[PDB]
Design a protein around this ligand. Sequence first.
Ligand SMILES: Nc1ccn([C@H]2C[C@H](O)[C@@H](COP(=O)(O)NP(=O)(O)OP(=O)(O)O)O2)c(=O)n1
Ligand SMILES: [Mn+2]
Ligand SMILES: [Mn+2]
Ligand SMILES: [Mn+2]
Length: 379
Amino acid sequence: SSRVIVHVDLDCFYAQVEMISNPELKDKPLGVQQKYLVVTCNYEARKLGVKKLMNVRDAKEKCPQLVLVNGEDLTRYREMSYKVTELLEEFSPVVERLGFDENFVDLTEMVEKRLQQLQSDELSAVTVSGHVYNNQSINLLDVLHIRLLVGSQIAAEMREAMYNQLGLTGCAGVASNKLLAKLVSGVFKPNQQTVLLPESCQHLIHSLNHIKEIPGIGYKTAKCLEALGINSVRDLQTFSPKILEKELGISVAQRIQKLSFGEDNSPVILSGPPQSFSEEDSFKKCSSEVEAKNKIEELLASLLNRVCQDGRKPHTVRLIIRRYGRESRQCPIPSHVIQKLYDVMTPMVDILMKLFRNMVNVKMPFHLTLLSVCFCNLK
DNA sequence: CTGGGGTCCT
DNA sequence: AGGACCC
Ligand SMILES: Nc1ccn([C@H]2C[C@H](O)[C@@H](COP(=O)(O)NP(=O)(O)OP(=O)(O)O)O2)c(=O)n1
Ligand SMILES: [Mn+2]
Ligand SMILES: [Mn+2]
Ligand SMILES: [Mn+2]
């Protein structure tokens, strides 16, 4: 029943891409800016006190010589993201993406194949690659330890191929489920890997200082838990199941409590091709609808290129706005438009404008801060 | 001085 | 259509 899972997370991903493009940025402290947000920075900048998701002005205040590069266009990072996923799919076909810079891979089948090839003399020769969490002792007669060590070897080969083939460094964690692999992948950063033997699971889980650090417990759930006197992992572990269900629902309650024990039965799912393609534009003000129409047309031009590139056709379109708290309207895409994928621009513009005005009233003044377009329902 | 994306559930 | 979650 026991699995071997790996989780790979990339070092300062966006910054890493920018440093690959312009090597002049390699040794200077580097931040990647999106409007007023330094969304990540390289490790030289983190030495100087820059943190991820800092304000531009807090960033330059803590580090005035910070070099900033614009990262509002995700094209190059998206390309790199999928190159990493495809490389990992060479190892095992079933690879789960999380965001742009993280992948899970279920190594179980691979581990077993490698050990079936091994003879009894060399089971004694199996060595860890990288760090062992909590420097736990390895017991070579424990088959779980052996399997996780082989998993750590496969993780090292993976990171070495990402570097040799794509020039990318990242951290990996090897553990027995997705949650533990993802928690352990970050223990030694950057560009290192860690493996978690079962006896250390509780240690890893209690090393966290608040429940929001558990993937699956977000802003709102954390708030509700804090209103219940639950702040530590052990608080959640020892809390009443029944009160928890009543407060958050049965699924949320049971899942997050199991998580608080380090238990996670969820499988590694094949992410495959994207389920949707969207673009966003943020701004201080949009009040003229011919302006709004310009913004929109700008968005769609790029999305039409990308949709064409993938070679599938979307069967739904959505328009999203935020007023001076987000709202959307969607509709199907007419079949002749779909088959045309010819001037597909103009019809799509008219459709999206009709949705626009369904949501906002021009006859009245309006203040719009975010305008976004999503193409989903691909086939 | 709070981006620009994604997933699945309800 | 919105909401929760992830990065
Ligand atoms: N809220 C967020 C989180 C991440 N990102 C982008 C920028 C990051 O470089 C990239 C990966 O996210 P991340 O792993 O959380 N941080 P990053 O990889 O930059 O640094 P590490 O701490 O992982 O080395 O996604 C974002 O644009 N908005
Ligand atoms: Mn990440
Ligand atoms: Mn990362
Ligand atoms: Mn969380």
